[PDB]
Amino acid sequence: MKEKIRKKILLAPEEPGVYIFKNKGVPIFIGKAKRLSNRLRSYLNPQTEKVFRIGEEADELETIVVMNEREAFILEANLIKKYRPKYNV
Numbered sequence: 001m002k003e004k005i006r007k008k009i010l011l012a013p014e015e016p017g018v019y020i021f022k023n024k025g026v027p028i029f030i031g032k033a034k035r036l037s038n039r040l041r042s043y044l045n046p047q048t049e050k051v052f053r054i055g056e057e058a059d060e061l062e063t064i065v066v067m068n069e070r071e072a073f074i075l076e077a078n079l080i081k082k083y084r085p086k087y088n089v
Ligand SMILES: [Mn+2]
Pocket: 030, 031, 032, 076
């Protein structure tokens, strides 16, 4: 994983949000979190091959802090629909 992505993961707040792993400007995986800190840190110790791939292929990680879990829900759904990232099913 790129050092800047690791750094961004470790600095992420304990707040609800949506995250977007990207490569060459293109979203490759979108997810949401009740706590960005907790969810993103899971990427450092991959429990699945897919999680490994996402963190290795990404050259950028964007995070969007949101008001609450209801917002995370709809923002995530909307962004997935818009971008249809590689790793989202
Ligand atoms: Mn999701």
